Write a structure and sequence with these properties.
heteropentamer; A mainly beta (190); B mainly beta (226); C mainly beta (213); D mainly beta (216); E mainly beta (216); C: 213 residues; mainly beta; Immunoglobulin-like; 4-stranded antiparallel β-sheet; 2 helices; E: mainly beta; 2 domains; 7-stranded mixed β-sheet; binds a molecule of 4 linked components (NAG-NAG-BMA-FUC); Spike protein S1 (chain A); viral protein; SARS-CoV-2; BA.4 mAb; BA.5 mAb
Chain lengths: 190, 226, 213, 216, 216
């Protein structure tokens, strides 16, 4: 019997890019989930197949806390049955998803004067992402007859693009930190 | 270099079928999903259909759903559009437009377009035009300038071209776009404004050329005599 | 489907002025909106993708903005080459509906049309058809009205109009309306007139002739 | 939001026991790791032990496994640290630190000073360090001698004189009582016009002294 | 248990330079559970970094944390004169099992400053109580190493004096020292000349400030 280390997820100094979203597996802990829903730090707090207020009760074998950073416009794509750059090629939630989607503005944390280009996201992909799939390949696409062989060029694109996180951006283009809680049927409430 | 080249357009009777083809070069068609966007005469753009880079996904507009069929020859780098049960509401210019980024890149926009082919859905037969003179008169008196022209009437299909004096007269020439009459034949008028003091010494002739009917007419326009 | 709406239908601004074109979405299309420019006899040209990103090679004066259901394409300094049709297209859900398009035309002062009428040629009358043509030369704005009156009886159902593209030099439009009667019906009447009404005319002007004079 | 408040300073004799409290506010009490850190004077920070109030099983460092009992009370959001058989080596400042399971930051208490000695509480005697009649600057101060325990606060002219002041750390005399010196360096040409008064406050004995320092 | 070792034991740099403090762990530690503290003397520890890299509220951006596995680094880009203290690293976690480092002390490097020496005879009010305390003040010197010797009638004393040293001044980077000689009134009235002889790097010859008991 240990404590749920959710502090490592929400309070992390740096978040992962959405194409390489992080996943923290949790096992046999306990958490005061009544500390979570009433936190005014969260702007988006949507739970699917389960209610947030009644969360301090259920139990399961493993809860998964996935974290990444997308812009504010793309937060609606972190949801079941959604489409877009993020939902198709970065982070895809299943249709029968059972868990919560938490997100908050991190402009004060992830934006830099002149632009923060550390956060990236997959542009194109061979096929839409399966739910909970992580594609981290950076293979140049030989789009033309001439071979790139890692050499970017004419018909030789790089599959990833950087966000241009500047503080003066619009709220739809500001960075948001997302944490997706998913459950698997040890960890009970208190 | 980077370009698309449509093909297969023309004139088709209503209810009859027709297929357009979109050849590309400078890159590889397999790398991109391709769209088809048509534009009716004098109207806005209309998205018709889409096919993925691999053909596993095909999406059509509601107005051509079940009548058009999109396909691509990945092995030979080709895209086709099979159009059946064609109505006059299908008469338009058809472009094929390549998606900007490769593979599944549906959230940006088409960047490379073809020259577009024209599809005319009409049961009319090829007919040469009748060129009549629009002679200058007392009506053509804009204070020292007179207006004269030609009337290119009852032809099919498009287009015609009108020059004046075999190209020697270009200033002040207005060639209006053709109109489709209720007979299924196009009609067109070309006019030119000229000084009134040259109506007795300068000959004015319009050169009408309708290549679909191998028709070349040179019509002298003279002021009407009382 | 999601309905794309643009406004105004036509923008009339002098060169150098700031042009602000609107595009509205019936449902939220996120930032998946693209702007296209189409010059006459040309294929469309991608200006903006992903709501606000400028396409390669597009001059810096073109800029897009907006998210969800309300978007805006802004040409900072209008150039003589920009006057074309501008379409917006959603890319959130299939089908990728296009907007109605806004025609950016070059603004100028009011110029009344010069009106001219043409009786049918004797060559056409021998064919059994009579075509009276009414010409409206070099006017502005484009909004013009042509009324055919045969023996003071207002005509409808047998005439067609045609408007030229805005002239690249004096920024004026031209109109040609053609009445079409049979030779037998043509000889039943005497007074053939087209009544033109325009902004540059204080009241409708009428050009007329008398058959056989 | 979160705040940790500890109990006041304690003066215990050798062999006695002391119990320090740590009231926590912010609602993150039960789902947190609440530890106790000891820092002997001149030495570094030493982690003694901790406890999760949700589980109650306290874990101690090896050095403190025998003399230290760490408890917590959810019904009052207060953690306790009891130590028995106190020795003079146990004289240290004891902080209570808190790590919530929902954050990586650490919350600390203000600290509790526990002085282990037979010396009874005694107010200090304040003697003037009279200036003399170093190149134009004269030094003057106060000698705060023979007090127990720490600390004493020294202010000059009720705080109106802060520049050039050096209050030395106290030394523990062989008598068991502390003693320090607070000096100030001023321009010599001001000794006759400016009044110099040091203000000593020893809160453990509730002693306040204002000593006027004048030239010899 | 886990053992935290910091390097160097003392870091000595001038203002404006870059300080690279290290913290080596005997085992692999999660980077989400490493904190850095700054402790100025007489003050509670101040949390600088948590989660190996997150700056606490108010910490300037010249402080940065880094590292993973067993090696971690606290970097001060350009040292301000206030950035002097004893810096500790701390391994913590969601279990009551934390260990601290032994600490790294950062002192300022600065040009040599000779002290200003002042000697204070015992006050008449103190002499009324049977004790005489002579105070020798070393004011605003650098480096810290300094020698103070009490000479009573030219006799080297020992065992009846105590030294206090202020910590590095945040403005001029100098130290100050006070040496207090305590005698009985009986022993104080046995001798005449009372002198403290100060040796320091900034002094060409050792400086001796004195007074004769009874003189004005
Ligand atoms: C990591 O988390 C800390 C602490 O967060 C606080 O404690 C947790 C246990 C949860 O209860 C959180 O909900 C809670 O905020 C963060 O530091 C905290 O940051 C917040 C927001 O930046 C501060 O709150 C603000 O405080 C001001 C002034 O007090 C108010 O006016 C505002 O209304 C607002 O509430 C909070 O003071 C601050 N707390 C501390 C101790 O510093 C920290 O930012 C975070 N870091 C990362 C990288 O996520």
């Amino acid at each position: 019997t240990n404590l749920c280390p959710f502090g490592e997820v929400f309070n992390a100094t740096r978040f992962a890019s959405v194409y390489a979203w992080n996943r923290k597996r949790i096992s046999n802990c306990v958490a005061d989930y009544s500390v979570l829903y009433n936190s005014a730090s969260f702007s988006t707090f949507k739970c699917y197949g389960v209610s947030p207020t009644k969360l301090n009760d259920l139990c399961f074998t493993n809860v998964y806390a996935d974290s990444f950073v997308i812009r504010g416009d793309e937060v609606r794509q972190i949801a079941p049955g959604q489409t877009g750059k993020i939902a198709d090629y970065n982070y895809k939630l299943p249709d029968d998803f059972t868990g919560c989607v938490i997100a908050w503005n991190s402009n004060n944390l992830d934006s830099k004067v002149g632009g923060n280009y550390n956060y990236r996201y997959r542009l194109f992909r061979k096929s839409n992402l399966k739910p909970f799939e992580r594609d981290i390949s950076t293979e140049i696409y030989q789009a033309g007859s001439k071979p790139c062989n890692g050499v970017e060029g004419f018909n030789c694109y790089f599959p990833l693009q950087s966000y241009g996180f500047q503080p003066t951006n619009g709220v739809g283009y500001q960075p948001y930190r997302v944490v997706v809680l998913s459950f698997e049927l040890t960890v009970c409430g208190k | 270099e980077v370009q698309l080249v449509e093909s297969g357009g023309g004139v088709v009777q209503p209810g009859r079928s027709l297929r357009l083809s979109c050849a590309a070069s400078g890159f590889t068609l397999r790398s991109f999903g391709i769209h088809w966007v048509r534009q009716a005469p004098g109207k806005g753009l209309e998205w018709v259909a889409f096919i993925s880079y691999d053909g596993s996904n095909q999406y059509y507009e509601d107005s051509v759903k079940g009548r058009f069929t999109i396909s691509r020859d990945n092995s030979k780098n080709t895209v086709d559009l099979q159009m059946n049960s064609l109505s006059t509401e299908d008469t338009a210019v058809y472009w094929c437009a390549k998606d900007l980024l490769p593979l599944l890149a549906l959230y940006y926009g088409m960047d490379v377009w073809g020259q577009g082919t024209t599809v005319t859905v009409s049961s009319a037969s090829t007919k040469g035009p009748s060129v009549f003179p629009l002679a200058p008169s007392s009506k053509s008196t804009s204070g020292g300038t007179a207006a004269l022209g030609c009337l290119v009437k009852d032809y099919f299909p498009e287009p015609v071209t009108v020059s004046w004096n075999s190209g020697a007269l270009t200033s002040g020439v207005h060639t209006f776009p053709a109109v489709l009459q209720s007979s299924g034949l196009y009609s067109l008028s070309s006019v030119v404004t000229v000084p009134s003091s040259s109506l007795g010494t300068q000959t004015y002739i319009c050169n009408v050329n309708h290549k679909p009917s191998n028709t070349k007419v040179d019509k002298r326009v003279e002021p009407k005599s009382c | 489907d999601i309905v794309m709406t643009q406004s105004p239908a036509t923008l009339s601004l002098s060169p150098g002025e700031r042009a602000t074109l609107s595009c509205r979405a019936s449902q939220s299309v996120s930032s998946y909106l693209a702007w296209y420019q189409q010059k006459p006899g040309q294929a469309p040209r991608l200006l903006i993708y992903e709501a606000s990103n400028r396409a390669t090679g597009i001059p810096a004066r073109f800029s897009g903005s907006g998210s969800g259901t309300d978007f805006t394409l802004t040409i900072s300094s209008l150039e003589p080459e920009d006057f074309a049709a501008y379409y917006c297209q959603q890319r959130s859900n299939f089908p990728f509906i296009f907007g109605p398009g806004t025609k950016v035309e070059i603004k100028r002062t009011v110029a009344a049309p010069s009106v001219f009428i043409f009786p049918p040629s004797d060559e056409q009358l021998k064919s059994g058809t009579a075509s009276v043509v009414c010409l409206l030369n070099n006017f502005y704005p484009r909004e013009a009205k042509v009324q055919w009156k045969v023996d003071n009886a207002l005509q409808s159902g047998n005439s067609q109009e045609s408007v030229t593209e805005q002239d690249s030099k004096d920024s004026t439009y031209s109109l040609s309306s053609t009445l079409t009667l049979s030779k037998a019906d043509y000889e039943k009447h005497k007074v053939y007139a087209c009544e033109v009404t325009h902004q540059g005319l204080s009241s409708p002007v009428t050009k007329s002739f008398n058959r056989g004079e | 939001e979160v705040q940790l408040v500890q109990s006041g300073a304690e003066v215990k004799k050798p062999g006695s026991s002391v119990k320090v409290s740590c009231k926590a506010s912010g609602g993150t009490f039960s789902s947190s790791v609440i530890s106790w850190v000891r820092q002997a004077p001149g030495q570094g920070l030493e982690w003694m032990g901790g406890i999760i109030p949700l589980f109650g099983s306290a874990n101690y460092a090896q050095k403190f496994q025998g003399r230290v009992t760490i408890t917590a009370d959810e019904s009052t959001s207060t953690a306790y640290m009891e130590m028995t058989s106190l020795r003079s080596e146990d004289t240290a400042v004891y902080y209570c630190a808190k790590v919530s399971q929902w954050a990586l930051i650490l919350f600390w208490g203000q600290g509790t000073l526990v002085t282990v000695s037979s010396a009874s509480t005694k107010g200090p005697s304040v003697f003037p360090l009279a200036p003399s009649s170093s190149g134009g600057t004269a030094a003057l101060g106060c000698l705060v001698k023979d007090y127990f325990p720490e600390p004493v606060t020294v202010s000059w002219n009720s705080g109106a004189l802060t520049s050039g002041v050096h209050t030395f750390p106290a030394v523990l005399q062989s008598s068991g009582l502390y003693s320090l010196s607070s000096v100030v360096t001023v321009p010599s040409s001001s000794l006759g016009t400016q009044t110099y008064i040091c203000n000593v406050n020893h809160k453990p004995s509730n002693t306040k002294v204002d000593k006027k320092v004048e030239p010899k």
